[PDB]
Amino acid sequence: GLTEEQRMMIRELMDAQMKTFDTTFSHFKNFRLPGVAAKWSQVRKDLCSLKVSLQLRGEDGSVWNYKPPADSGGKEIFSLLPHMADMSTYMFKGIISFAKVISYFRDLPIEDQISLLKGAAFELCQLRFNTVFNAETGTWECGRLSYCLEDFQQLLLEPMLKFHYMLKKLQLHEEEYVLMQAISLFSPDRPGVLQHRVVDQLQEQFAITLKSYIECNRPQPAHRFLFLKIMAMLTELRSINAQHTQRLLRIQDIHPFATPLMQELFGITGS
């Protein structure tokens, strides 16, 4: 029960997701793996908040399985950074392809495109990982890869992990996940955006379509206020993004790891 423009909107967003999101992670390869003075206390706190074991199912049926070390006050806490930087770079490329395919994004001036991508790449990445997150086992299932949280109520103290469990509980459709990505991408208040009036009108239209979609396709009392919960999710995710951008820059300051694409998105110039 949407306007013709509203369903053309969902159709195009659902199309750009289909073309740019490798849900089986088939083309993620050549990645790195762990081998076979008051900043550090913060960096140690930054790192220990999301430790994860890693499983690789080979095409032949073999299984590699990695258990990370415990914190012993040394550089061994940096063991997973190259791999997770390689995974982030792969996700970021899918995000950039996603935005480039959308006509509303394409139509913005280029300098506004980079500004919007710098501001929302993390958030769109987190949103895509939620669709492959298994809340019953605490595992991100990325095709032949899987990432299982180490052994509960004290794990939800981490805001990002708390975000993933709450978003998964909302039981969202594919159409609702992609409208969330559009709203986060077309945020008029990212640093450096110039066409903020255009970008705000675009954002307001993606939110209105989402509100109408829920009310057309979700009449159950369980989904009362669902639109407002999602919009609050997005504000929460957005705060998680800011506070994590500093986590990453702190680690980068004392132990470099960011790929060239990660530097581009986060403002590191090379000197």
Ligand X SMILES: N#Cc1nn(-c2c(Cl)cc(C(F)(F)F)cc2Cl)c(N)c1[S@@](=O)C(F)(F)F
**Which residues contact ligand X (rule: CB under 6 A)?**
52, 84, 87-88, 91, 122, 125-126, 129, 140, 142, 147, 248
Is 126 assigned to a binding site? yes
What span, in angstroms and rounded, lies between the C-alpha atoms of 30 and 27?
9
CB of 265 to ligand X, least distance (A): 8
Please, where are the H alpha helices in 51-133?
A: 81-101, 103-106, 110-130
Is 257 assigned to a binding site? no
Is 244 assigned to a binding site? yes
- The helix or strand, by DSSP H or E, that contains position 136, with its residue range, turns out to be none
C-beta of 68 vs 188, nearer to ligand X: 68
- Smallest CA-to-CA distance from 214 within 238, 231, 202 is with 231
Backbone angles phi, psi at 163, to 5 degrees: -60, -45
- Give the CA diameter of the chain: 60
Integer CA distances (angstroms), 235 to 16, 148, 180, 194, 232, in order: 24, 26, 11, 22, 5
CB of 88 to ligand X, least distance (A): 3
CB of 33 to ligand X, least distance (A): 12
C-beta of 131 vs 212, nearer to ligand X: 131
C-beta of 94 vs 213, nearer to ligand X: 94
CB of 233 to ligand X, least distance (A): 15
CB of 148 to ligand X, least distance (A): 9
Q: Are 24 and 143 in contact (CB under 8 A)?
A: yes
Is 228 assigned to a binding site? no
In the DSSP assignment, the letter for residue 108 is S
C-beta of 130 vs 209, nearer to ligand X: 130
**Mode of pairing for the β-strands spanning 52-57 and 63-66:** antiparallel
Is 55 assigned to a binding site? no
Q: Are 43 and 256 in contact (CB under 8 A)?
A: no
C-beta of 25 vs 227, nearer to ligand X: 25
Is 78 assigned to a binding site? no
Q: Which residues are annotated as a binding site?
A: 88, 126-129, 244
Q: Which residues are annotated as a binding site for hyperforin?
A: 88, 126-129, 244
